[PDB]
Amino acid sequence: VEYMNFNELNLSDNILNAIRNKGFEKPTDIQMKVIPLFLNDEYNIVAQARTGSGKTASFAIPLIELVNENNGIEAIILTPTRELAIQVADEIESLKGNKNLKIAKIYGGKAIYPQIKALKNANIVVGTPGRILDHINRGTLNLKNVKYFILDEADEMLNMGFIKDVEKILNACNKDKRILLFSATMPREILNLAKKYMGDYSFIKAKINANIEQSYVEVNENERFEALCRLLKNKEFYGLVFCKTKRDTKELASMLRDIGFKAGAIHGDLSQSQREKVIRLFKQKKIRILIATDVMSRGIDVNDLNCVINYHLPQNPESYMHRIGRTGRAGKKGKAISIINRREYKKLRYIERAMKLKIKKLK
Amino acid sequence: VEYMNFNELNLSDNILNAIRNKGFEKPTDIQMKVIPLFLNDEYNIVAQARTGSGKTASFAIPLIELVNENNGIEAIILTPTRELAIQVADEIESLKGNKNLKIAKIYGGKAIYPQIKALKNANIVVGTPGRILDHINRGTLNLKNVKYFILDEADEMLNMGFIKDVEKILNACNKDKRILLFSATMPREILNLAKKYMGDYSFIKAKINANIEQSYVEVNENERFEALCRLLKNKEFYGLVFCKTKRDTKELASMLRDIGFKAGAIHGDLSQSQREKVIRLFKQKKIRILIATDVMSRGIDVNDLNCVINYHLPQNPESYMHRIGRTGRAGKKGKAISIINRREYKKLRYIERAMKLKIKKLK
C-alpha cells in the first residue's frame, strides 16, 4: 500500500482539479498515509505530524470529499488559535471548488449573534475549543449532525488549558462520530485522550526529517551574500530564498538580478494583487528566484520547489517548519539549506532539538 | 473489512484443519480483528483484550502461518509467568499440524545448558522477560533473525517490574521486527511503551460489553430455583448453568429431570472417565443442559453455547470472565444471565469493579 499521486485516490473530480490548481501537485508523506485512511473511513486516526508537512490538506481534502453540502453541520475542527482557525478555513475554501460547503469560523472577540446566523447553514465549523464549547451549550450549535471530529494541534491545545474543554466538546457529541487527532508531540495526556475518547484508532507517524534533507552553511556575516550565490550557482536554480525584512528582499533581489539571475521580491506591505502577480511570474518560472519574508511564507504558495534557502534562520522553530515546508514531495527528495554565522549556533541546535530534526553541514 | 469464519482468512490448509480440530469453530471478536491485521502484516498491533477471549489464538495462529520452519528463531513471545509461557507454547503445538516448528520455552529454575541446545534449532521462543534477556545479554540467544515480537500480558509484566527488561529486550533487536502487544489494561506505561518502541501501530480493543450482553435477576434465596426455571423456560434452551458445589449440581440436575429436562451434573469428584461421559452427552445433546461447578469451567469445553447462566455468582471474579467467555461468538451475539439474591448483590458489585463491567437487570 504505497500511493504517489492524488488521482490514484478515491477523490472526486471537482476537488482533484482545485488541488492540482492550488499547487498541490505531488502529495506529502502524511497526505499519502492519511487521505486514504480518512477516505477509507474505516477507523479513527491519531496522526503525528510537524506543522509544515501538509497536515491541513490531509484532513481538509477528504473532508470536502465526504461532507454533504446539503445537511447541516457535519464536521467540527478544533484549533489552538484563531490564526490557525482562519488558515484552516481558507485552505478548505481554496479546495471545495464547485462544491458549496459553508464554513463557519467560531472564536472569541466576535459578537455571538452574527456567529449564530453564520452556523445557520454552516456545513463545517472551525474554531477554538473555548468558544465552540459555550456556543454548543447555548444550543446555538447542533452537534446532532456532526459526523467528523478533528483536533488540529492537540498538543498545542493541551498546553493552553483547552484539554478540559476539548473533552467536554467530545462528550456532548454523538458516539457515531469519526475522530482524527493531529499532534506534533505525544504527551501522556494526548495518548490518554486517544484511549478515553477514540477507540480502535490507527496510529500514524510521519517523518519530515526523512522527507527534506536539511543542511546549513556557516559563514561570516560579510560572506553571507557570497554563500547564497555559491548556493544559487547554476542559472538553472529554481527556488525560494527567505529573508528577515522587506528591505532584505528588495535589496537581495535587485542585486541578484544585476548579477544575472531572474530574481524578484515579495513581502508584507505589498498589495494583495502584487503578491499575486509575483507568485504568478514565479509559478510560471519567469522569476526563477523568489526572495521573501515569513509574511508570504504563511498565506500563499501555488507550487512546489526543488529547494528552500533560509538566507536568515529564524529564532522560531515553527517558522522554520513553515519555510522548508514547500519542498516536501511525494516519492521524490526535498532540499533546504540554511545560511548561518558563528553566533547562530545555539539556535540551530534548538530547532533540531525542538523539531527532533537533524540538519547536517555544507562548506 | 470484517469476516466471521476462519476459512475466510488467508490461513493455510494445514492449520485451518487443526483449528477446526482443536475446537476453534467460530472466531472471537479479537481473533477476527487481529488475525487479519497480523496476517495482513501491514502495521504493529496494540490489542486490549481480557484474558479469556481467544488472545493466544489471535497471535499463535498467524504466527504458525508466517514463521518459517526452516530458518532459525523468527519469533519471541514474552510472558509474565512460566505457567503462561507453557500454556502459550502448548496452544501453538496443538495448532501447527504438519508444520514442523520447534518451540523453545525459556525461563528460570532450569539449567542454562539444556536451554542452549533447545534454542539450537528453535523456531519460536516463549519465555519470561528476565531470562530471555540474560540469554540475550550473554550471547546465548541471538535476535538476528527475530522477525516477530509478541508481548503477551504486558500490563502483568509491568506490575512485576519486568518493564525495564522488556525494554532492553526490545532495544537489542532489529528495528525491522513486527511487534504485537497484548494487554487487558492500558496504563500510562503501556501506552508510552507503544509510543517509544512500536511506531505506526493499529490499536484494537475487543470490547466485550457489546459482544456478550450480561444481565442479572435479583430474587429471594427461596425463589432462586424458580428464577432458573423462568430463565430455562422453553424446553428449547441449550446451555450451561453454574453452581457452587457438587451437591448443587446433582440436586439441581435432578430437580430439572423432575420437570422433564434432560440435564447433567459435572464436578471435581468426577473422574475424567466420567467428566467425559457427561460432556460427551451434553454436546451430543443426549442432555440439553449442563449444570457445573467452576471445576470443569476451566479445563474442558468442546463447543459453543447460546447462553450461560450463573446460578451462583463465583467467588473469584476472574472465574466470571472465564464462564461468560463461552457465549462470545464471532459477530453473532451471546448472553450471560446471573442469578443473585438480595444479599448476593454485594458480590455482584465487587465483580463489576474488579472487571470494569456493566451488568444490567432483568425482572
Curated annotation (Swiss-Prot), chains A, B:
User: In chain numbering, where does the motif Q motif fall?
Assistant: 4-32
Work out whether the entry's keyword set contains Thylakoid: no
Family matches, as PROSITE patterns: DEAD_ATP_HELICASE, HELICASE_ATP_BIND_1, HELICASE_CTER, Q_MOTIF
What is the protein name given in its UniProt record?
Probable ATP-dependent RNA helicase MJ0669
Superkingdom, according to UniProt? Archaea
Question: What GO molecular function annotation could you give as one example from this UniProt entry?
Answer: ATP hydrolysis activity
A Pfam match: DEAD
In the record, the note on similarity to other proteins reads: Belongs to the DEAD box helicase family.
Q: Where does ATP bind?
A: 49-56
Keyword annotations from UniProtKB, A to Z: ATP-binding, Helicase, Hydrolase, Nucleotide-binding, RNA-binding
InterPro entries given in the database record: DEAD/DEAH_box_helicase_dom (IPR011545), DEAD_box_RNA_helicases (IPR050547), Helicase_ATP-bd (IPR014001), Helicase_C-like (IPR001650), P-loop_NTPase (IPR027417), RNA-helicase_DEAD-box_CS (IPR000629), RNA_helicase_DEAD_Q_motif (IPR014014)
The intrachain disulfides are: none
Motif DEAD box: positions: 152-155
Organism this protein belongs to: Methanocaldococcus jannaschii (strain ATCC 43067 / DSM 2661 / JAL-1 / JCM 10045 / NBRC 100440)
Q: What class of enzyme is it?
A: hydrolase
Record domain Helicase ATP-binding: where:
36-204
What catalytic activity does the UniProt entry give for this protein? ATP + H2O = ADP + phosphate + H(+)
